[PDB]
Each structure stands twice: as structure tokens, then as C-alpha cells.
């Protein structure tokens, strides 16, 4: 359903505890693939296979997915 991916830069360190979650450090640029629910994005690290979900509150949203 998404027509344009978004992007964000991490503003907090996030340790995912499960396979569905994507860990990252402050400063990592993340492509936003979709908003999963009220609290989580699915994203990916550009040029890689790191993909999974993380909390919206842990990133600075530059562009929302459309």
C-alpha cells in the first residue's frame, strides 16, 4: 500500500529483543518502510539486509512513509 518510503535518523539507542525488532545506535539513518501500528515503524538500513521494527519514539522522522 505504501507509495513512498520515508526515512529517519536514530535519536536513542535501541536494542531489539526478538527477531522482528531491528537494533540500532544513535545516528543511524533508517529507511521507513511502513508504520506498523501507533507505536512502531518497520524500517531497513540503506544498502543492507538489516530490517525490522522499532519504536517511533526512538527516531527523528525526516519523512513519513506515504
Amino acid at each position: 500500500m505504501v507509495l513512498e518510503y520515508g526515512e529517519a535518523i536514530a535519536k536513542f539507542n535501541f536494542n531489539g529483543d526478538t527477531q522482528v525488532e531491528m537494533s540500532f545506535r544513535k545516528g543511524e539513518r533508517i529507511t521507513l518502510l511502513r508504520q506498523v501500528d501507533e507505536n512502531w515503524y518497520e524500517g531497513r538500513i540503506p544498502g543492507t539486509s538489516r530490517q525490522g521494527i522499532f519504536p517511533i519514539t526512538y527516531v527523528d522522522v525526516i519523512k513519513r512513509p506515504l
Binding site: 536513542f12 539507542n13 535501541f14 526478538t18 522482528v20 506498523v36 501500528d37 507505536n39 512502531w40 521494527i53 519504536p55 519514539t57 526512538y58
Partner: peptide, 10 residues
């Protein structure tokens, strides 16, 4: 130090 982790999606 970070915001509390929200509950996971369904």
C-alpha cells in the same frame, strides 16, 4: 537511557 519500550504490535 531511552524512552520506555512500547508494547509490540499484534
Amino acid at each position: 537511557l531511552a524512552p520506555p519500550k512500547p508494547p509490540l504490535p499484534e
